[PDB]
Amino acid sequence: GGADCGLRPLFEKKSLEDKTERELLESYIIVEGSDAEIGMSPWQVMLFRKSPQELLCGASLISDRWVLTAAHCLLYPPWDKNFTENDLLVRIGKHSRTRYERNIEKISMLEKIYIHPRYNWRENLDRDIALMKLKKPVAFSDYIHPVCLPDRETAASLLQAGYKGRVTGWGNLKEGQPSVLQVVNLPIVERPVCKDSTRIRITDNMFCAGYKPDEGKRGDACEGDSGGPFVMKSPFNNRWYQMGIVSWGEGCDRDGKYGFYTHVFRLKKWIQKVIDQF
């Protein structure tokens, strides 16, 4: 699925708007978040461990058989983390964090995991991106639907300082756990400001987002949210596009710090190549 990407069965398709999307549109020229609405993020996926039944990370559905996430969720040697297809399963269509959602969610097994060959776990998580092929295609529904991948022009016009994106996840609410999927809208921050907030070498394959100390508003992703989608709604065709992947941050919601995200468009060629070959 991809011709109908970014159009939510319970919102766009019915001409209904969610509680906070206007905030995103008005800016075009999870800690401190809120409960998501049912069907608000139908591409949200839960990365899950089979052994101790645990939430590992968030992820997103980009087609009936492909899930996108952060590579650190799968491979992070400094913490002795190195998962294979058989160590995980994906849960699509969820709202409740712990509750197994009978008749609503779908569970899939992984066929193959592809980690960007130049993923830099040794230093700054440069190119923190991974693709996962589902063993069997997932059937879409009101709660399951793929998000679109950005094209050059969508990335050009939307990825600007001040423009707000949206992050969703079942991660920690503070640096305990939410009962349902949380959502927070955050503004993209100027690259210089991102660089000057950390000692870590940031690259062109990343962007940071969050409110500045003087802005009053707060919000950020936290443990459990990584691998999840940072999305924006295009004001041109009204579809939702995944601009980033929750990558890293120093703590959660700390003043003067910002969440960092993988720049999806810059790595789009690797995505296309992988899906076109495998």
Binding site: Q53, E54, L55, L56, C57, A70, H72, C73, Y76, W79, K81, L89, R97, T98, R99, Y100, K106, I107, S108, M109, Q177, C222, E223, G224, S226, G227, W248, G249, E250, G251, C252
Partner: peptide, 12 residues
């Protein structure tokens, strides 16, 4: 950073 559950029935 860096990266309670109900058992999943044998339904996948």
């Amino acid at each position: 950073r860096x990266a309670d559950y109900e058992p999943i029935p044998e339904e996948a």
